[PDB]
Design goal:
Subcellular location (chains A, B, C, D): Virion; Host nucleus
Order of helices and strands of chain A: EEEEEEEHHEEEEEEEEEE
Structural class of chain A: mainly beta
InterPro entries (chains A, B, C, D): Adeno_Penton_B
Number of domains of chain A: 2
Distance between the termini of chain A: 13 Å
Oligomer: part of a larger assembly
GO molecular function, one term (chains A, B, C, D): structural molecule activity
Largest sheet of chain A: 4 strands, antiparallel
Largest interface: A-B, 66 and 74 residues
Keywords (chains A, B, C, D): Capsid protein, Host nucleus, Host-virus interaction, Late protein, T=25 icosahedral capsid protein, Viral attachment to host cell, Viral penetration into host cytoplasm, Virion, Virus endocytosis by host, Virus entry into host cell
Shape of chain A: elongated
Number of helices of chain A: 2
Protein name (chains A, B, C, D): Penton protein
Number of strands of chain A: 17
């Protein structure tokens, strides 16, 4: 016999609506959307004892969050880079870890990468180009091709003049003494390079693992298709393409070059030896992979089997664990059919990484989820406080609206 | 009366969250995502006896897996090919089974095939072109046309100069003494050529079944539409197209040729005789068909009706069997409206197989599935171990995040 | 108290997984995917009596089937056609029913039709063009326009020189003494011409019902827009368009022609008189309409209210009736923005029927369906046999994988 | 204890399948798909008394219906129009309500409208152009622009020479003494002009409400951008555009014109005065809005709380009320990136209304719905009769296949 004191007991199963939009006077500041809402939406619901009152907990979780958000570390990625070329002491270049940041905004796939190899170009124009770096030693440069296709193993070059533009998977492209870090960050699932043994902190794809990859050097089709004029062969690889930038082709064998990619080194490399055995190749998951969204009602809902009845932004008794309602769509890219991302328009390695045929992008579907019956505090107060917390128990500042219908009902006696 | 010892019994139905993200200190290495997670997320849940405690088991299965992955054999396909042309002993070409591998990466349809007939071109440039193969005898070459359309049965040729570019279904195109194998592999459902009596190991579409197919030879429209000049007919089929490569037109009847396709031989052939009666023609299913994902909680959940309470990466008591959450989308291809895949740009048979109008591609939908009530170990330990295993009982190394809410509740007494 | 004999009774609700992938040794041949799978997946489950054991039956039905498949009659359609022109006896053309077949393959909309009026062109080039048919009397020719738009009822012609290319609904286009049959077939729902009183076998849209339709004859805009030169009107309809083919314009009124379409005759015709009153106009449903997929477990599941406990590929006790998991998608066609289908490029009636703006195509969604509780044989054997049968009780040879979790539980006593 | 008489009682919950495809011998004619199907699919199910047998009623409702169908009045719309110009008696034009009809066929958005202002062009060429109407007085003409944008309120014209082509919402465009009617019809939701107080029969948007709207007259940019030649202003509006048709610009103020649209008059007009206060502006809903589909089993299912146990095509005891399974999709139109709809290619008002960026179109999803438990006749006969009726209790002649699994089970005793 649920009661409300002096409003006629409406016994047996009822409902109560932890609404949100309304009473927006005493929960300003203390807000975001870990709100403290009210019931009795007129202008202490003592449940009937002698019955362990349970409650169904439907909800609505219309979230709102870009795929690149400095809340959950996603717009940062520590990347090494050649800072100084031929310093005075020790005639040898110098490397210093830089920590990059790219703008926020719910970005599609082929733009996030196309933004990555623009960030690690600014910290080349900023602190680097003024010293000695000669624009061919940019270092790390995210790309998304498979450089070794037209590679006939009679000459070991790449015959069709230029690398192929059909983008397969994204991948890193390094240089002697570089590399990236993705721990203390998470712009890896977006790249889709997540690591076997995915725990064990540390993820540093630096050019001591990638070797064995080594993208091949392009063949000078301005000689191959020009020497046959003299015949009707000079399979000389290219180093100085227009706007002369040496591809850093290693000198002991000029049929190869540096820029030892991460792909190829996970394909044309060596299993249980090369970059295999701790690097997978999952899909270009843009929606940050995923995160839980630990729902929480410190009152009304009793507690899970073993939670600390505490008071803090964290340590709330979690009740219900949806997903972060972000469904990654996928649209058939059309651009496949002068700029600022494609800075170098001749360097066949540094050119803009062509867009993958299936451009993915995050979304926001209002997950009208559900949670099974679960016990009630048997004495709901006139004021409750919903709260939406991620993994690391911070209150999610991107939820746009939550509800939380609650249908009480009996479960047992006494 | 569920208890936790000295934390006040919260009797009747509760919930317990086999989370994953967190305690990432004693399950490194022993990880992937057949993790060993913990409850009591503060910083031995003895269930109440006298009641066979059951439990609902919702879950979340945000997977992450490309459609071409050497985990489940999918990037390999044993294919025969003409290795040596006119060897010294026995003046007759030689055939030797090769075993191919194509790069990983969540590939769309018209690129996987467009990659197949690039792999079996490398092992022509590698070990083959140096000996005697004259580029017209590539052997197997995956395609996706229906060569016999403009085939007016008064001359039995193919009138409109060239084969038609409207891609219907993918299909194989062979040569006297070739063929493919797809057992010990699975790049067949992707081709959509799965075999009647789909068990019974062995699937070898070699050119002793395809005959009766035999794509027709193109008519020399440079004579038909040139002899009428002399008239206002010479229906002479073509053998030497620009960059002279003989279509291997069989000599006893020059109105036909070799390259006996697999299509046509499942259409313009013979029922209960030709390639019919053990080859279907299912849709170009790219998502590897499908696989189960045997969920498993060796503790908490008792066991199925008859499982071995064992200890091993395999033999776990399976509980719940979702699908591999890979929903194959389908986008209206646009390319229908110099390269490296289209190596030969004149050979009307070897040209790049035009893309099907509906390009399909795999995806990854987070399957928030469900499983009915099922008994509990009646004494959950403080540490559980979720685990996600495929068919062949290996732990799936591509799952990206799993959860597994568990709502206990009574089922009976004693 | 469910038992398994000498493996400790795991009393109360359990589960049992009629898996499929595995034991692939004694169900080869006897396969397709009406398999005979096993439980006890270690390497006679006597349920507890005194309780009418019921069972939930979830399942997974990852099918795999093109929209044009000679299994369910869909790639055939008996079509009449003018075989002989002016035979010796009785100076009058002769008509003989032909039975056509088009290739298989999961075909989109505007290609199936574009294949239809290619089949009934081969059996014009094959047996027909050699006799007397003069290419303007092809007979039936599937199309998808609405020929009577620019038809100003002051002259009753079609002013804008040519018929309009905006494709509305598909429709048939006949000729004096032709017609089609679609019984003993089903390529009608794909055309979307299904018949009122859809039972009552027989569906023959022959040119004795279509009359009253009669597409209008085009106006010679090479005279209308040329006589005003002589003025600044000769509304003479056209008969001989380039490559002279008479539109078969009937001689008593030259402001009309033959080719009496099926559309127009279901629009600009006569209700309760013309083709109305037994022909609808449903959507261009490509997914063969739909079919049931009678699930069946001859053991485990008792039987429906009144089934014959028989033994045969048919007569299985059906349990659960999903749909054929084929969801017809719909993509905005792009081609709207020399060939072989568009054989005649001048004949304004015989030209390639322009593609509808919304191209539909079949798909294959893995229908993770459900079925309510239903009784159990109370003595499951160690070996069961799932089986998937269509309407006409044949075992579907296109299912690619089935599962069938079964969660037993009590329903009553005794 | 459910029985079947002499086939062994299969007591407790069973199932029974009101299938459809099969017994197609005694339900021809009496068909459509309000069929009369049979159970006992071998070749009087007395349920057990002493228990008010209830039954779950799942179903399948694979419908099939175009968005323009003369079944539910949707292809008609009474529209007034200027029939006679300057008749003999009373030198003043004459108006007479016409009743239009457009062809059927599941039509997309920007074609239905593009068909509307083609119907009300035929009944201008038919009965109208022969008398006196001078093609500039077509009257009603459906459009989808917002004519007043480049309307700088210093001259009150429309500066950018021509109206803007970015289509916003569809809208009507009238003329002194015209208007439309949409009662006794329903091609309004498709236009998206549904009326506040949506009951109260009558919906006549005639040019006595639209005034205050009055689209503005275009500025002669052949003078404005030509008088500055004489200067380096003559803001003279245009009346005679090429192929001279006066825009019916009202003479007292030549900075305006007639063709008083419906948009603008619901925007740049007057709230609680103009077309506001009884006209909304809902989305361009193409799927006829929606309709119920009153399921009905005159036997098996008892009756609702208060239905007439009658016998008629109507008055069936309704059981279950799904939706008409028509899900309106939405595709990004591409045409935004000589004809017959765009008859007048110069008249800036009469030109083809540019297509909205989001082209919507109906579909047909097989709604595998559900209905809660509901009582059974406790004596099912061997022959039942499913039936699918719309609002006005006619049997829907567009359903393509229905099923209707029925799972009986107890609800109470006696």
């Amino acid at each position: 016999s649920i009661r409300y004191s002096e409003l006629a007991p409406l016994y047996d199963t009822t409902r109560v609506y932890l609404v949100d939009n309304k009473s927006l006077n005493y929960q300003n500041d203390h807000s975001n959307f870990q709100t403290t809402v009210v019931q009795n939406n007129d202008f202490t619901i003592n449940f009937d004892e002698r019955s362990r009152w349970g409650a169904d907990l439907k909800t609505i979780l219309r979230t709102n969050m870009p795929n690149i958000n400095e809340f959950m570390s996603t717009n940062k990625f520590k990347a090494r880079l050649m800072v100084e070329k031929k310093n005075k002491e020790t005639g040898l270049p110098r490397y210093e870890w830089f920590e990059f940041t790219l703008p926020e905004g719910n970005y599609s796939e082929t733009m996030t990468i196309d933004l990555m190899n623009n960030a690690i170009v600014d910290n080349y124009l900023e602190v680097g180009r003024q010293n000695g770096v000669l624009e061919s030693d940019i270092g790390v440069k995210f790309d998304t091709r498979n450089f070794r296709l037209g590679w006939d193993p009679v000459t070991k070059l790449v015959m069709p003049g230029v690398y192929t533009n059909e983008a397969f998977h994204p991948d890193i492209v390094l240089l002697p003494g570089c590399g990236v870090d993705f721990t203390q960050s998470r712009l890896s699932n977006l790249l889709g390079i997540r690591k076997r043994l995915p725990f064990q902190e540390g993820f540093q794809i630096m050019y001591e693992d990638l070797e064995g990859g080594n993208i091949p050097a392009l063949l000078d089709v301005a000689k191959y298709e020009a020497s046959i004029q003299k015949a009707k062969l000079v399979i000389e690889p290219v180093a100085k393409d227009s706007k002369n930038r040496s591809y850093n082709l290693l000198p002991n064998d000029q049929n190869n070059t540096a820029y030892r990619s991460w792909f190829l080194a996970y394909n044309y490399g060596d299993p249980k030896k090369g970059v295999q055995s701790w690097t997978l190749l999952t899909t270009a998951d843009v929606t940050c992979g995923s995160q839980q969204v630990y729902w929480s009602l410190p009152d009304m809902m009793q507690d899970p089997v073993t939670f600390r009845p505490s008071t803090q932004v964290s340590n709330y008794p979690v009740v219900g664990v949806e997903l972060l309602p972000v469904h990654a769509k996928s649209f058939y890219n059309e651009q496949a059919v002068t700029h600022v991302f494609n800075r170098f328009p001749e360097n066949q390695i540094l050119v803009r990484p062509p867009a993958p045929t299936i451009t993915t992008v995050s979304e926001n579907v209002p997950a009208l989820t559900d949670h099974g019956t679960l016990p009630l505090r048997s004495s709901i107060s006139g004021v409750q406080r919903v709260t939406i917390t991620d993994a690391r128990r911070r209150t999610c500042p991107y939820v746009h609206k939550a509800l939380g219908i609650v249908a009480p009902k009996v479960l047992s006696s006494r």
